Every structure is written in C-alpha cells, then in structure tokens.
Scaffold this active site. Structure first.
Site, mmCIF file in Angstrom:
data_model
loop_
_atom_site.group_PDB
_atom_site.id
_atom_site.type_symbol
_atom_site.label_atom_id
_atom_site.label_comp_id
_atom_site.label_asym_id
_atom_site.label_seq_id
_atom_site.Cartn_x
_atom_site.Cartn_y
_atom_site.Cartn_z
ATOM 1 N N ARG A 34 0.841 -1.184 0.000
ATOM 2 C CA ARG A 34 0.000 0.000 0.000
ATOM 3 C C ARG A 34 0.876 1.234 0.000
ATOM 4 N NH1 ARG A 34 -2.209 -1.752 4.548
ATOM 5 N NH2 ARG A 34 -3.874 -3.330 4.369
ATOM 6 N N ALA A 36 0.068 5.738 -0.632
ATOM 7 C CA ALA A 36 -0.858 6.770 -0.190
ATOM 8 C C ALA A 36 -2.232 6.591 -0.832
ATOM 9 C CB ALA A 36 -0.296 8.147 -0.537
ATOM 10 N N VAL A 40 -0.889 -2.286 -4.679
ATOM 11 C CA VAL A 40 -0.822 -3.482 -5.507
ATOM 12 C C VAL A 40 -1.453 -4.626 -4.722
ATOM 13 C CG1 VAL A 40 0.679 -5.019 -6.829
ATOM 14 C CG2 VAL A 40 1.362 -2.661 -6.445
ATOM 15 N N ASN A 168 12.736 -1.543 -6.169
ATOM 16 C CA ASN A 168 11.826 -1.525 -7.311
ATOM 17 C C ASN A 168 12.248 -2.595 -8.316
ATOM 18 O OD1 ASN A 168 9.928 0.335 -6.596
ATOM 19 N ND2 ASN A 168 10.758 2.029 -7.798
ATOM 20 N N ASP A 181 7.737 -0.530 -11.359
ATOM 21 C CA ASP A 181 7.507 0.770 -10.745
ATOM 22 C C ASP A 181 6.326 0.650 -9.796
ATOM 23 O OD1 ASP A 181 7.147 3.497 -10.080
ATOM 24 O OD2 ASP A 181 6.142 3.947 -11.988
HETATM 25 C C1 LIG Z 1 7.930 -12.219 4.987
HETATM 26 C C2 LIG Z 1 7.680 -12.184 3.423
HETATM 27 N N1 LIG Z 1 6.294 -12.161 2.777
HETATM 28 C C3 LIG Z 1 5.419 -13.435 3.020
HETATM 29 C C4 LIG Z 1 3.969 -13.363 3.591
HETATM 30 C C5 LIG Z 1 6.473 -11.885 1.302
HETATM 31 C C6 LIG Z 1 5.429 -10.800 0.900
HETATM 32 N N2 LIG Z 1 5.235 -10.412 -0.505
HETATM 33 C C7 LIG Z 1 5.271 -9.120 -0.900
HETATM 34 O O1 LIG Z 1 5.474 -8.310 0.012
HETATM 35 C C8 LIG Z 1 5.077 -8.748 -2.366
HETATM 36 C C9 LIG Z 1 4.845 -9.684 -3.406
HETATM 37 C C10 LIG Z 1 4.720 -11.216 -3.417
HETATM 38 N N3 LIG Z 1 4.724 -9.041 -4.559
HETATM 39 C C11 LIG Z 1 4.854 -7.718 -4.409
HETATM 40 C C12 LIG Z 1 4.785 -6.710 -5.487
HETATM 41 C C13 LIG Z 1 4.555 -6.842 -6.884
HETATM 42 C C14 LIG Z 1 4.269 -8.038 -7.715
HETATM 43 O O2 LIG Z 1 4.178 -9.159 -7.293
HETATM 44 N N4 LIG Z 1 4.120 -7.719 -9.024
HETATM 45 C C15 LIG Z 1 4.277 -6.387 -9.181
HETATM 46 C C16 LIG Z 1 4.206 -5.655 -10.369
HETATM 47 C C17 LIG Z 1 4.404 -4.250 -10.290
HETATM 48 C C18 LIG Z 1 4.669 -3.581 -9.059
HETATM 49 F F1 LIG Z 1 4.836 -2.255 -9.078
HETATM 50 C C19 LIG Z 1 4.741 -4.329 -7.879
HETATM 51 C C20 LIG Z 1 4.538 -5.762 -7.956
HETATM 52 C C21 LIG Z 1 5.078 -7.434 -3.046
HETATM 53 C C22 LIG Z 1 5.273 -5.968 -2.509
#
Ligand SMILES: CCN(CC)CCNC(=O)c1c(C)[nH]c(/C=C2\C(=O)Nc3ccc(F)cc32)c1C
Length: 303
Positions: A34, A36, A40, A168, A181
């Site tokens: 998240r 502001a 995603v 990023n 991004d």
């Molecule tokens: C302790 C670790 N966690 C386990 C519960 C791992 C958490 N997972 C996470 O935080 C996480 C995951 C699995 N994907 C994203 C982000 C993106 C994605 O997948 N495609 C995108 C395409 C464009 C973009 F701008 C961001 C993303 C996050 C922040």
C-alpha cells in the site's frame, strides 16, 4: 510515478479488444503493497492468458482518498505499460479493467518473492560464494545481469526509470527478476529511502549528481542508480552509505568523486563496474547496452 518516457526524445488509443479484462474473471485478495493513494493487490484471474486456466496476478489499483489526479496517473502507467511491451526482465501487463462503473485496474505479472532488497537481506544466513536454497555469487552476478538487460530493453523503448533501486526490482519463480515501478503503491512519506527536499522527497542515495543539483534525468543518470543497485546486490540488501547522514554535506563529497567502499560479497570486477557507473561525467559511465555484456562476461567467468 517513476517509469516514464525519455523527454530527450519527445514528441495511439487504448486497444480494448486486446487488453480489456472482465472484472468478473478477476478475484481480489491480500494487498502486497500500500502507498498513499495506490496499492498493488494479489489477485486470481481466470483464463487471462491460457483459456480456462486460473493464474495468480498482481493488480494495480487506487485506494480510498484518491482523486481523478491519481486515476489519471494510473491511466498513464497502463499507457506506458502497453507502450514498452513485453520483456522478461521487466514486469509485463497482462490486461486491464478500464470499463466504466468500476475501479480502474491494471493487471501485471505477480512475483512470488517480492522486491529484491528485502529478499537478499533475508538470505544473509543462506549464502555461499560457490546446499539447495542457498544464494551464491553465480546468482548475484545473474540478477545484476538481468536488470542490465531489463534496463536495456527499457531504453530501447525510449523510456527512463527515475527511481531505479533494488526495492523496485522483483524476484519471481526460477530466479527471474523484473524491473517494476511500484508507483502509487509506494509511500515516499513513510519510506526513509526517500529524503524530504521542500515537499519533494527524493531517493537521494540513488540519484546521480546531475539529477540532484540540476534535475537532469537520463538513461545515464540511471546507470549511476544501477551502480548503486549493484552495491545493494553484493551487500545482500544493505542500504547505501551506512550511517552517513544524507544532507547538504553528502551531496558535496559525491561530486568530489567520493564513492562508497566495497560491499561484503562483491568481486573485484563487480566493484570496479560499480565505480564506472559512478563516473562524475555522465558520458564516461557505460551504456546499459554495454553493462549487459560486461556482466554477461563476468557471469561466464564465475564458472
Ligand atoms: C515475509 C515475506 N512475505 C510473506 C507473507 C512476502 C510478501 N510479498 C510481498 O510483500 C510482495 C509480493 C509477493 N509481490 C509484491 C509486489 C509486486 C508483484 O508481485 N508484481 C508487481 C508488479 C508491479 C509492481 F509495481 C509491484 C509488484 C510485493 C510488494
């Protein structure tokens, strides 16, 4: 948002038949990031690319309190997403719900391991230069090389990444890494990698000097960022310039040709690479097109 077209080379409607995707074939889930006004969210999307197969995706969308200003920002991301088109080392667009009567939604590749920084920083225990699961120097060279390539493709489509950092960059299955991004889904007023400068808050550790003093973004003031990106990698997800307070002072020494030391896992070659990327004169520091090969070279030399 951060991945935009290069102004060095300015100065086409949306293809709904190819891109538009049924809000009723898309099943929303937990938020991955998240910011502001943006976020995603992880989603399950039926038959989005293989007829009749489900598929885990990442859907970019607004959250509460957004204005049409944001909504236009998000209309923009989709637009350039469609522009740049498919490459493997960048995040790709899968489809979009741009129908009326519903939240705008851009659907993009899901990356099961999230951003690189947080990933490497967690792997500090399970690393070795040369036992399953463990990171090795082969991987690290490989990731770097993938991003160079990704950055190259990103150049070929006449774009620039005005926020290139290991935060990023995402890791997915099978050691693929994709430049992304986070856009609105990153809050810069809550991430300390972003320094306040007026009401502008900037990734100063990453920003090349010309960008900082003047405000010249170029494919090349990116290589600098990529030099810093290399550091983050061969430190396993350490934030740049340790302890160093980022201030009027910092910026000074930087153009006095003052660079970071070597990260803990770097190889000699890698470190010097990082040092090219950190040339004072934006012309002297290599093209991503040139980094792609050196790293390709280095990756062969590491067995
Ligand atoms: C302790 C670790 N966690 C386990 C519960 C791992 C958490 N997972 C996470 O935080 C996480 C995951 C699995 N994907 C994203 C982000 C993106 C994605 O997948 N495609 C995108 C395409 C464009 C973009 F701008 C961001 C993303 C996050 C922040």
């Amino acid at each position: 948002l951060s991945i935009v077209m290069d102004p060095d080379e300015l100065p086409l409607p949306y293809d709904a038949s190819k891109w538009e995707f049924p809000r009723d074939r898309l099943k929303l889930g937990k938020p991955l990031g998240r910011g502001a006004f943006g976020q995603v969210i992880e989603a399950d999307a039926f038959g989005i690319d293989k007829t009749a197969t489900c598929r885990t995706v990442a859907v970019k969308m607004l959250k509460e309190g957004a204005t049409h200003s944001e909504h236009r920002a998000l209309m923009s991301e989709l637009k350039i997403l469609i522009h740049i088109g498919h490459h493997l080392n960048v995040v790709n667009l899968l489809g979009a719900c741009t129908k009326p009567g519903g939240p705008l939604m851009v659907i993009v590749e899901f990356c099961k391991f999230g951003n690189l920084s947080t990933y490497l920083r967690s792997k500090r225990n399970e690393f070795v230069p040369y036992y399953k699961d463990f990171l090795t120097l082969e991987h690290l060279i490989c990731y770097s090389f993938q991003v160079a390539k990704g950055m190259e493709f990103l150049a070929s489509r006449k774009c620039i990444h005005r926020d290139l950092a290991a935060r990023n960059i995402l890791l997915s299955e099978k050691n693929v890494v994709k430049i992304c991004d986070f856009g609105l889904a990153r809050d810069i007023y809550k991430d300390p990698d972003y320094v306040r400068k007026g009401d502008a808050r900037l990734p100063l550790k990453w920003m090349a000097p010309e960008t900082i003093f003047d405000r010249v973004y170029t494919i090349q003031s990116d290589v600098w960022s990529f030099g810093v990106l290399l550091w983050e990698i061969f430190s396993l997800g350490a934030s740049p310039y340790p302890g160093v307070k980022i201030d009027e002072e910092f910026c000074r020494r930087l153009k006095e040709g003052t660079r970071m030391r070597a990260p803990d896992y770097t190889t000699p070659e890698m470190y010097q690479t990082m040092l090219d990327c950190w040339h004072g004169e934006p012309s002297q520091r290599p093209t991503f097109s040139e980094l792609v090969e050196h790293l390709g070279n280095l990756l062969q030399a590491n067995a």
